[PDB]
Amino acid sequence: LKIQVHYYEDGNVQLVSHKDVQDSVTVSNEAQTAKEFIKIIEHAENEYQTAISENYQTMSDTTFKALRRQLPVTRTKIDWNKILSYKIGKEMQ
């Protein structure tokens, strides 16, 4: 399964997603086997799309946080006067 999305309104974003699935079935009747096959398609694609939606939901919390945090660990905006005037304050250890 492959998904490719591009969106470029006053910016640029390119999602490229890929999934590989493996399953087994039993061959008894052609109509029954086809129905079982389509049920497997249903389950696989539904779980894949719901997984993509969940991955988007947990983007800001965990996935995106590995690159840049929304706020510092102190949970307050940097006091630039403080950092400029005073040293880091870790001189003692």
Partner 1 sequence: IANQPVVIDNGSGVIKAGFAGDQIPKYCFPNYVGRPKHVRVMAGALEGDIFIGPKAEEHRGLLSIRYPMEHGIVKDWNDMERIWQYVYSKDQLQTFSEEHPVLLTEAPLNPRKNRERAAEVFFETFNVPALFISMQAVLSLYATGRTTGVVLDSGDGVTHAVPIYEGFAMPHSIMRIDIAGRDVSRFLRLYLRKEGYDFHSSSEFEIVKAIKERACYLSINPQKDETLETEKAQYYLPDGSTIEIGPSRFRAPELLFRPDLIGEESEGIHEVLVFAIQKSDMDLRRTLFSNIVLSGGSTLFKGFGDRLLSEVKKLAPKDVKIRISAPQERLYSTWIGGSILASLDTFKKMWVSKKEYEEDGARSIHRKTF
- Any contact of residue 42 with partner 1 (CB under 8 A)? no
Site for partner 1 in 9-28 (CB under 8 A): 9
- List of residues 6+ apart from 85 with CB closer than 8 A: none
Bridge partner residues of 13 (DSSP): 7
Half-sphere exposure of 12 (CA within 13 A, CB side): 0
Q: Does 68 bind partner 1 (CB under 8 A)?
A: no
| Binding segment (CB under 8 A) for partner 1, from list 17-25, 28-36, 37-45, 81-89 | 81-89
Contact predicate 1/16, CB 8 Å: no
Binding site for partner 1 (CB under 8 A): 9, 60, 69-71, 73-77, 79, 81-82, 85-93
